[PDB]
Amino acid sequence: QRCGSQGGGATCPGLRCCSIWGWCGDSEPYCGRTCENKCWSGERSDHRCGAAVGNPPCGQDRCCSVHGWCGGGNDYCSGGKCQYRCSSS
């Protein structure tokens, strides 16, 4: 969908990255240099994620687990273990 300043001020469904052009996605055009919000660079230094820390992004190839931490691989990204930005699902 549409998001951010181009799209009415919406956050992306699934806490995906909002590009500067106002569209949601998960790839570098959306999440990297041309990202407007929930970008790869916005992951907390302590890597917490989830609702308790205001649903911050995780970095590239990292996923927010159901326990509230960003990380990579199955324990963070795969079915049942991932609550958003799931690089698997």
Side-chain angles (χ1 to χ4, degrees), residues 22-45:
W23 288 97
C24 298
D26 310 291
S27 51
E28 201 289 326
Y30 294 89
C31 297
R33 202 191 72 72
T34 45
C35 179
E36 185 180 308
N37 73 56
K38 299 305 184 189
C39 312
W40 287 335
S41 62
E43 183 180 328
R44 286 170 63 95
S45 54

Side-chain angles (χ1 to χ4, degrees), residues 42-69:
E43 183 180 328
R44 286 170 63 95
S45 54
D46 63 12
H47 314 289
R48 278 206 57 54
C49 64
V53 285
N55 290 126
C58 293
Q60 184 166 8
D61 295 311
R62 293 161 58 80
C63 311
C64 178
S65 84
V66 292
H67 300 293
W69 302 88

Side-chain angles (χ1 to χ4, degrees), residues 65-81:
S65 84
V66 292
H67 300 293
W69 302 88
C70 299
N74 293 350
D75 289 8
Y76 292 88
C77 296
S78 306
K81 294 283 79 174

